[model samples]
Target: KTHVQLSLPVLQVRDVLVRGFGDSVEEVLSEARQHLKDGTCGLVEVEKGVLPQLEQPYVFIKRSDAAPHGHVMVELVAELEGIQYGRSGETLGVLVPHVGEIPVAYRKVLLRK
Candidate 1:
């Protein structure tokens, strides 16, 4: 029998919901600057409004100094168990092990039924 499987959705850095420091944009920027300077990842509380059906309470926001003018990267707290293969031996999608943390650009290879 055929069945449908779903995996965690990937989100863009700019599209993520951020926790601001103050009313002004500059105030938030200053906080971000501190996070970058300290070389640490900032945490953001995930809300149902931002991500529908999301169970995780929070996610990590990583700042990349290597990027031009620095850019933010979002890391979802999820684990990828393996990938799903089709009858033709082609990749269908990924299989999440559980609700955990993983980088947006994380890569892995494996097959599972």
Candidate 2:
């Protein structure tokens, strides 16, 4: 017989699930942003009853049994309990954690004589 210890983090909006420790905040938020663009922000529940329209689309993720091999898996959630409790987006406002990303290009310099 083996005992499987259940240890999963109870995440909430503004909370992040980083693959490993010291994950990149900017990168995680960027992915969540894409999901937001595709649709609104909220969690959706599928069950026998009516599909609980978590109205506020939220990208979800699960923790791994072990740390990442190289980089790691990271995810950031917008809302947590509100989805089930039925909280107004207005009250929460369209708030997203992290400053997002900053894209830049490389500069090629010519050799001077």
Model 1 regions lying over 4 Å from their true place: 1-18, 43-48, 51-113
Candidate 2's C-alpha runs over 4 A off are 1-22, 43-113
Give the TM-scores of the predictions, in the order they appear: 0.25, 0.20
**How well does candidate 1 match the true structure in TM-score terms?**
0.25
- The deviation in Å at residue 9 for candidate 2 is 21
Model 1 lDDT tens row, 29-52: 344334433433223234446433
TM-score of 2: 0.20
The backbone clash count of each candidate, in order, is 4, 8
Model 2 — which ten-residue stretch has the worst lDDT?
Answer: 104-113
Inter-residue clash pairs, candidate 1:
77-100, 77-101, 78-100, 78-101
